[PDB]
Design a binder for this molecule. Sequence first.
Ligand SMILES: CCCCCCCC/C=C/CCCCCCCC(=O)O[C@@H](COC(=O)CCCCCCCCCCCCCCC)COP(=O)([O-])OCC[N+](C)(C)C
Ligand SMILES: CCCCCCCC/C=C/CCCCCCCC(=O)O[C@@H](COC(=O)CCCCCCCCCCCCCCC)COP(=O)([O-])OCC[N+](C)(C)C
Ligand SMILES: CCCCCCCC/C=C/CCCCCCCC(=O)O[C@@H](COC(=O)CCCCCCCCCCCCCCC)COP(=O)([O-])OCC[N+](C)(C)C
Ligand SMILES: CCCCCCCC/C=C/CCCCCCCC(=O)O[C@@H](COC(=O)CCCCCCCCCCCCCCC)COP(=O)([O-])OCC[N+](C)(C)C
Ligand SMILES: CCCCCCCC/C=C/CCCCCCCC(=O)O[C@@H](COC(=O)CCCCCCCCCCCCCCC)COP(=O)([O-])OCC[N+](C)(C)C
Ligand SMILES: CCCCCCCC/C=C\CCCCCCCC(=O)O[C@@H](COC(=O)CCCCCCCCCCCCCCC)COP(=O)([O-])OCC[N+](C)(C)C
Ligand SMILES: CCCCCCCC/C=C\CCCCCCCC(=O)O[C@@H](COC(=O)CCCCCCCCCCCCCCC)COP(=O)([O-])OCC[N+](C)(C)C
Ligand SMILES: CCCCCCCC/C=C\CCCCCCCC(=O)O[C@@H](COC(=O)CCCCCCCCCCCCCCC)COP(=O)([O-])OCC[N+](C)(C)C
Ligand SMILES: CCCCCCCC/C=C\CCCCCCCC(=O)O[C@@H](COC(=O)CCCCCCCCCCCCCCC)COP(=O)([O-])OCC[N+](C)(C)C
Ligand SMILES: CCCCCCCC/C=C\CCCCCCCC(=O)O[C@@H](COC(=O)CCCCCCCCCCCCCCC)COP(=O)([O-])OCC[N+](C)(C)C
Ligand SMILES: CCCCCCCC/C=C\CCCCCCCC(=O)O[C@@H](COC(=O)CCCCCCCCCCCCCCC)COP(=O)([O-])OCC[N+](C)(C)C
Ligand SMILES: CCCCCCCC/C=C\CCCCCCCC(=O)O[C@@H](COC(=O)CCCCCCCCCCCCCCC)COP(=O)([O-])OCC[N+](C)(C)C
Ligand code: NA
Ligand code: NA
Lengths: 531, 180, 531
Amino acid sequence: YYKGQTALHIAIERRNMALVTLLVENGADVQAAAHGDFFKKTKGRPGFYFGELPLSLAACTNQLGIVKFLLQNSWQTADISARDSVGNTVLHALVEVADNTADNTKFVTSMYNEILMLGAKLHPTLKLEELTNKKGMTPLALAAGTGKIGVLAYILQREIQEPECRHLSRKFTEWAYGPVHSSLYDLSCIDTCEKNSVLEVIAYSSSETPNRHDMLLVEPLNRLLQDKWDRFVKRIFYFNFLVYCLYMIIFTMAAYYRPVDGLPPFKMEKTGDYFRVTGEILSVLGGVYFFFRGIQYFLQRRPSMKTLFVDSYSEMLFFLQSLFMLATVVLYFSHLKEYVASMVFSLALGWTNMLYYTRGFQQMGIYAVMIEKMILRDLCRFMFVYIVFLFGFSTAVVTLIEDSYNSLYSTCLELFKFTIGMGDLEFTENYDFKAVFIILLLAYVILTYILLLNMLIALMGETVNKIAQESKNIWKLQRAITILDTEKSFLKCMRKAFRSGKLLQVGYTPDGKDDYRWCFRVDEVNWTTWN
Amino acid sequence: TNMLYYTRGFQQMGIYAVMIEKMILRDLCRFMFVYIVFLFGFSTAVVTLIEDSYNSLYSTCLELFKFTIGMGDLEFTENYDFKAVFIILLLAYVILTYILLLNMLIALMGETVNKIAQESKNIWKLQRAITILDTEKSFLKCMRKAFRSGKLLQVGYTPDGKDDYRWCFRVDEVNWTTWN
Amino acid sequence: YYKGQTALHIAIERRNMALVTLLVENGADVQAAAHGDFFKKTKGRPGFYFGELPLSLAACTNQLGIVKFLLQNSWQTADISARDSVGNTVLHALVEVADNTADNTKFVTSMYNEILMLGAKLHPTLKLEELTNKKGMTPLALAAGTGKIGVLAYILQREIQEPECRHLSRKFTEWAYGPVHSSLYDLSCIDTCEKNSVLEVIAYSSSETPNRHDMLLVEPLNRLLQDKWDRFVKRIFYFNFLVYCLYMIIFTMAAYYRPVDGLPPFKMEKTGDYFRVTGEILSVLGGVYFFFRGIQYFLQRRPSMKTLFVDSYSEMLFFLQSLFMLATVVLYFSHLKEYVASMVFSLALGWTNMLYYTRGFQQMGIYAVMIEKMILRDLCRFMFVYIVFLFGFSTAVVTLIEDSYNSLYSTCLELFKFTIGMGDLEFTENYDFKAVFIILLLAYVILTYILLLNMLIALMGETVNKIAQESKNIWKLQRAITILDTEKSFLKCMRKAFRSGKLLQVGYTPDGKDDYRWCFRVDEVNWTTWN
Ligand SMILES: CCCCCCCC/C=C/CCCCCCCC(=O)O[C@@H](COC(=O)CCCCCCCCCCCCCCC)COP(=O)([O-])OCC[N+](C)(C)C
Ligand SMILES: CCCCCCCC/C=C/CCCCCCCC(=O)O[C@@H](COC(=O)CCCCCCCCCCCCCCC)COP(=O)([O-])OCC[N+](C)(C)C
Ligand SMILES: CCCCCCCC/C=C/CCCCCCCC(=O)O[C@@H](COC(=O)CCCCCCCCCCCCCCC)COP(=O)([O-])OCC[N+](C)(C)C
Ligand SMILES: CCCCCCCC/C=C/CCCCCCCC(=O)O[C@@H](COC(=O)CCCCCCCCCCCCCCC)COP(=O)([O-])OCC[N+](C)(C)C
Ligand SMILES: CCCCCCCC/C=C/CCCCCCCC(=O)O[C@@H](COC(=O)CCCCCCCCCCCCCCC)COP(=O)([O-])OCC[N+](C)(C)C
Ligand SMILES: CCCCCCCC/C=C\CCCCCCCC(=O)O[C@@H](COC(=O)CCCCCCCCCCCCCCC)COP(=O)([O-])OCC[N+](C)(C)C
Ligand SMILES: CCCCCCCC/C=C\CCCCCCCC(=O)O[C@@H](COC(=O)CCCCCCCCCCCCCCC)COP(=O)([O-])OCC[N+](C)(C)C
Ligand SMILES: CCCCCCCC/C=C\CCCCCCCC(=O)O[C@@H](COC(=O)CCCCCCCCCCCCCCC)COP(=O)([O-])OCC[N+](C)(C)C
Ligand SMILES: CCCCCCCC/C=C\CCCCCCCC(=O)O[C@@H](COC(=O)CCCCCCCCCCCCCCC)COP(=O)([O-])OCC[N+](C)(C)C
Ligand SMILES: CCCCCCCC/C=C\CCCCCCCC(=O)O[C@@H](COC(=O)CCCCCCCCCCCCCCC)COP(=O)([O-])OCC[N+](C)(C)C
Ligand SMILES: CCCCCCCC/C=C\CCCCCCCC(=O)O[C@@H](COC(=O)CCCCCCCCCCCCCCC)COP(=O)([O-])OCC[N+](C)(C)C
Ligand SMILES: CCCCCCCC/C=C\CCCCCCCC(=O)O[C@@H](COC(=O)CCCCCCCCCCCCCCC)COP(=O)([O-])OCC[N+](C)(C)C
Ligand code: NA
Ligand code: NA
């Protein structure tokens, strides 16, 4: 429970540096692993994780005075790159304690900064931020993989002004001319990390992770993706859009001109059949593609059963579109006419999945984001209550009918017409009590047509005033995933033409070598930083 | 419809016509795009299922457009093999287009109206400005003497000492804190 | 232009009291009337009205130092009750310069206060606020009749704490017990002024006058009207509501059971005819009442031709209802069957004019206020543009028709059905160019049904977020007019049972007599005025 604890750990938490220096000098080890249940990840349990190391506690506890003392104390100094059972160094652990509150975020960045210089002063050659925990994550990847907007916003924009501690800084100013100054961000382990690039950790993450849609608004990420978009992804996406439009044009005609006389599989007799079956072949191939391309997705992005509809609503429909295509082949060689049933759901999904390609366009893609939110939020709530009413009042109605609408389908079908403006208040005379039939339909109409549909309009308006920004940021994330799924798939061998940035020598290795870094230029202006 | 041009001589009507032309270009074009994708998506589906007369992409698209103007028959064909498909598909069309998307547009418009309200007053004044300028050019176009806003008002002196005559526009104003 | 000006007037405006004392002592009159064009009411002209008297200028110019000097200067003192050609004293003129800005309102109240005490110190017996100008208005009535919310809010709540200057104060505290304190407002010339009570000047005013709907929120007015409402007006209004409901029940049945065989005037043959003509008599009498009761209104409230729809939308409909009734009598004895046309508009107006009586109920009356605003604002704008479209596309359509809808009525009638959800896209086949007919109707539908109706919903929502408070305050003013039209009409001889307040001796005449004042009690609590 407390397994691994020391009285040194006590003193750091009880605000007692007078006794930390007392315990270390008498030989209290400063590598001790508090590998006890209370000291692990909370996960609901009443705990505090800090890093399973004394130095880690002081960093997560805001005594920078203590922290420095642990590292130049003459009796014994903590190993700066010492990690825990999870593999988390102090900087790793210093991320996992972040919670994206300003009082926390101001501190963690203030502290995270200071262990770096200290480790640089102690060890100009050791690289701390490159260290990886047990899982395979860095402090940068951990911040992005865990939702830590302020830490990430710090690490990327890390401009340090010190003689020996600029090789750690990441946001470099190359030149300046009056109010104009031209910054430089680093892109090391952001676009092409061998393991867990920041982009590939923000985008291939789960909606449980907070602030997925806010992290890409951190500079340079936004500018970086719009650079990949403008350079090579936009052309490929428009091309992917064209092929899918030609696909659906072809699957549409091969469907429209389906044989009607016989049972499948049908015969190549005239020339139009040959030029149609072609389209039918090409129709299936896309389904196989979207099938494999969906299996791929739902393996390498092991989907949380709830996250399917939030993060992956479109992928679900392309996959579902594929399934109806494959069922359409199983049933076309199984001689069953029911291939058409499947085939028509593929078309309808197929054409609606054009809205996928809205994400190459801001105002249309934001609109399609609002659509998928309204579906999952406002419409599902609506249709639930609507069907309770529909089924409630239908049963009532069809129980009153005597004799033909003496069926729960037709009555439910007639009562659904009221909500699409096609309700007859006289669709039956076959009953005994007109007062009942009318009171009941009016109650249905008032509750459903006058109230509930118009309430939905009102609910939607509330939603639109709320998800307006959320939907812009879900849009940019949709486009980000396209940029990443693209640059993988398209290149997948060379990975040299999408190199955002360039070799820009920014400074020097603290030993003295040159500091070459792939860096992203950003041009900026100020009118109050006059110095 | 180009009568709505002449709304710009009237503030509350001209602002309304500005909102109209914004909704057309912003909210309606986005809508009708997505609407036609759905309309054409579900029509093809429907007319592919039809066997026999609505066995035409016009008439099916024409019948499915009626749902959105409140004139949809869920029984406009019996000429098919699979009623479950025909109904699931039209209901999906109706739910997506009539229940969701039209009512979403109302909701989008309301968001727009809360935003372009000031923008539209200022686009209105600019519309009227262009009328004032296109007018005073065209009407006079020879004399250009009756529209002289302001008057010769001697305001001061040339720094050499001559008089400073300037066409000037008078504005009357009040203050209750500039007591000096 | 400057007719009547003096060099004394110069010095007050040029910030020069050193020379005001110079001019008066040499004999410069301090009664001089600046009865010149620049010194009269602006009314668009570039002027400054101040009161046509020197003392009046200094009060409207913010030199209280000067003002006091004018009245104890030994050479000659301004007459405090000296008025101008308009009849406005300094206090009158001090109202007309108010503009309901805080910097102005803070001052005018600060100054208005001080001439009163000064006039009280000079003249404990003269009554300044009772003085009336040429028109017949007091400084209190002028503030209400002219829209001066802060002045009025000052005068009514005027609590002064001085030994000799409480007989001027109006808001008296009678008792106090800890945090509880029980105030007392005066009601002199507020509910029963012989001339221009504040209520009868706020309510019988024109919408041009700003802040009609805000003035009644000034205490004690709001509490005072809710006291008349709860005491005697609510019962009478519900009674007036009952009689009108019995009226319309009777005019409804006499209309429903109208003779159908013959020409009017019809014959009393059976008994139901006698018991019907009765209702027809009683029907007309209400019309005469609402006719005279409307003539009355539109004489003693000489209506601005634009103000008809804003302040008097309902009165217009009751009057119009009356006219259709009287035309129904002119045409029933003129033997013409067209009495029915008139009669049915009376009914439809008659029943819709139930919404009048919503103003006895807050949430319904506010709703009826929103209705009449939407009609005049949102619907009229809509229907204008709608009819341009309707008529634009109809002419287009009927010009294309060849042959029967070859009529501008029927086409306009068919195209109006699209907007009520009853449009047929196939109402004609009688034409030559189907592409044109369809493109044109779709353009009509898209512009009118999809855009413009739904835009109206959106416009209404904007309006509702705006007029929500405005409509509550227009409601209270509607009810106020009912309270005033009631207490006049009902009593109209005795005027003794509606006496809001009671004789409460508050203090003393500065000579020494008792100070009896009709006063309105208000109970209040504080938790920071601990003294
Ligand atoms: C458009 C963009 C997409 C791509 C181009 C596609 C070009 C489009 C054209 C392509 C081929 C046209 C055939 C010409 C010769 C036969 C004419 C004939 O009898 O037609 C008839 C049927 O015709 C068919 O059924 C043809 C099949 C059309 C499927 C769409 C093409 C598939 C793609 C692979 C093809 C190569 C393309 C590959 C390169 C991309 C016309 O109809 P009908 O006479 O009334 O017959 C009964 C109708 N009923 C069944 C409804 C009751
Ligand atoms: C290409 C193949 C099909 C033909 C094209 C059809 C679609 C049109 C072309 C699409 C791709 C090529 C266009 C590039 C040029 C700019 C377009 C433009 O006007 O953008 C403007 C409007 O926005 C749109 O026009 C976008 C609407 C289409 C999005 C796809 C939705 C579903 C397609 C179903 C189609 C039916 C398919 C079946 C029949 C073929 C601006 O967009 P934005 O919102 O401000 O975003 C930022 C713009 N930016 C990214 C450029 C900076
Ligand atoms: C003249 C020829 C046609 C007859 C007149 C018809 C139109 C009416 C007259 C138009 C011109 C003359 C009117 C001047 C007097 C004021 C009008 C008024 O009530 O304004 C008010 C209402 O606003 C309106 O009445 C404006 C509505 C009409 C605008 C034109 C739109 C399309 C016309 C299609 C017509 C069908 C044509 C086919 C059949 C003929 C106030 O307006 P406002 O919004 O508060 O703006 C500020 C007002 N201000 C500028 C005055 C300060
Ligand atoms: C409800 C609250 C309001 C006040 C009370 C009112 C009580 C209501 C009743 C009142 C009188 C009923 C008459 C009874 C005797 C005749 C019966 C008869 O033949 O009826 C017939 C017609 O009947 C009429 O036309 C009657 C006229 C009704 C007008 C309403 C009453 C007017 C108020 C003054 C009266 C005294 C009240 C004064 C005190 C307030 C019935 O219809 P029918 O047989 O089918 O005839 C043809 C129908 N068609 C013409 C449609 C084709
Ligand atoms: C009387 C004669 C007719 C029968 C009555 C019918 C109407 C009802 C009775 C009306 C008068 C007597 C009711 C007093 C008791 C309270 C009512 C109540 O529930 O108020 C509540 C609801 O509000 C309403 O019920 C008001 C709705 C009716 C307003 C009139 C509109 C048109 C009438 C057309 C009628 C058809 C006529 C044709 C057939 C007859 C509360 O109201 P509120 O909005 O919160 O306001 C504050 C309440 N306060 C002022 C009490 C503090
Ligand atoms: C003479 C014969 C040929 C006639 C003309 C052929 C052209 C026929 C036309 C259309 C159908 C084309 C083939 C099927 C593809 C389906 C569409 C598709 O997946 O588009 C992808 C575009 O991205 C691509 O990579 C598309 C393929 C590129 C090659 C161009 C088509 C020719 C290949 C076929 C060989 C032809 C030879 C014969 C084949 C029998 C979709 O984009 P995505 O990025 O996957 O994103 C959506 C899905 N996701 C969001 C879930 C990820
Ligand atoms: C979305 C639309 C509305 C709901 C649809 C789902 C409900 C499923 C509906 C029907 C039952 C499922 C099918 C079972 C097998 C067939 C039996 C059958 O259909 O009905 C039987 C009767 O049955 C009733 O009248 C009561 C059945 C409904 C109650 C069960 C709860 C449904 C819960 C979910 C409800 C939503 C709860 C609210 C939302 C949370 C037999 O009737 P018939 O065959 O028509 O008889 C015709 C006789 N003839 C041959 C002479 C002409
Ligand atoms: C929030 C919870 C949801 C709401 C739950 C409650 C909802 C309940 C709603 C409505 C209930 C009230 C309407 C009537 C219902 C039928 C009863 C009946 O038998 O009527 C008879 C009418 O008898 C008459 O005398 C006519 C008067 C009724 C007018 C019709 C209603 C208009 C529709 C809107 C009304 C909205 C009012 C509702 C406002 C709440 C019908 O039989 P009949 O044979 O035709 O009789 C006369 C025929 N004759 C004249 C030719 C001789
Ligand atoms: C706005 C309304 C919806 C869209 C309209 C635009 C689409 C253009 C529509 C039709 C094609 C254009 C006309 C070409 C020449 C005539 C062929 C034809 O009409 O259809 C052929 C079939 O064809 C099909 O069934 C598939 C055709 C549509 C797929 C092409 C993509 C459209 C892209 C844009 C779509 C929007 C994408 C979504 C928005 C971004 C022939 O059919 P038919 O002649 O009826 O056969 C009757 C047989 N009879 C004689 C026995 C009775
Ligand atoms: C977000 C994405 C968009 C939405 C996509 C999905 C949308 C899909 C929507 C709806 C799908 C569900 C409705 C049924 C569909 C047809 C299937 C079928 O064969 O039914 C049969 C009914 O069989 C029955 O037993 C009656 C029960 C169904 C009630 C009718 C639905 C009411 C309309 C509103 C429901 C809304 C529920 C939907 C809520 C989501 C019809 O055949 P039949 O021969 O008439 O059979 C019985 C006849 N008999 C009783 C006389 C014997
Ligand atoms: C057996 C015979 C009698 C049968 C029963 C009689 C009862 C018949 C029933 C209804 C009709 C009653 C007579 C007509 C009045 C019309 C309604 C009206 O104006 O109401 C007013 C109520 O305030 C009143 O003062 C109404 C009259 C009170 C007396 C009660 C009715 C008897 C008088 C008649 C003599 C009966 C003897 C015979 C007469 C031929 C309206 O209120 P308001 O404040 O004016 O506000 C609205 C208008 N404004 C906003 C524009 C201002
Ligand atoms: C609100 C509803 C829409 C507008 C209504 C107001 C417009 C007034 C409408 C008609 C004219 C007024 C009546 C005059 C006398 C009769 C002539 C007539 O009716 O039409 C003539 C034709 O005329 C046309 O086709 C053009 C007439 C309309 C243009 C005039 C401008 C209207 C301006 C305001 C417009 C709103 C502007 C937009 C809003 C600002 C004769 O046609 P007919 O007799 O049918 O011929 C049938 C032949 N048959 C016997 C063989 C069958
Ligand atoms: Na409808
Ligand atoms: Na309808």
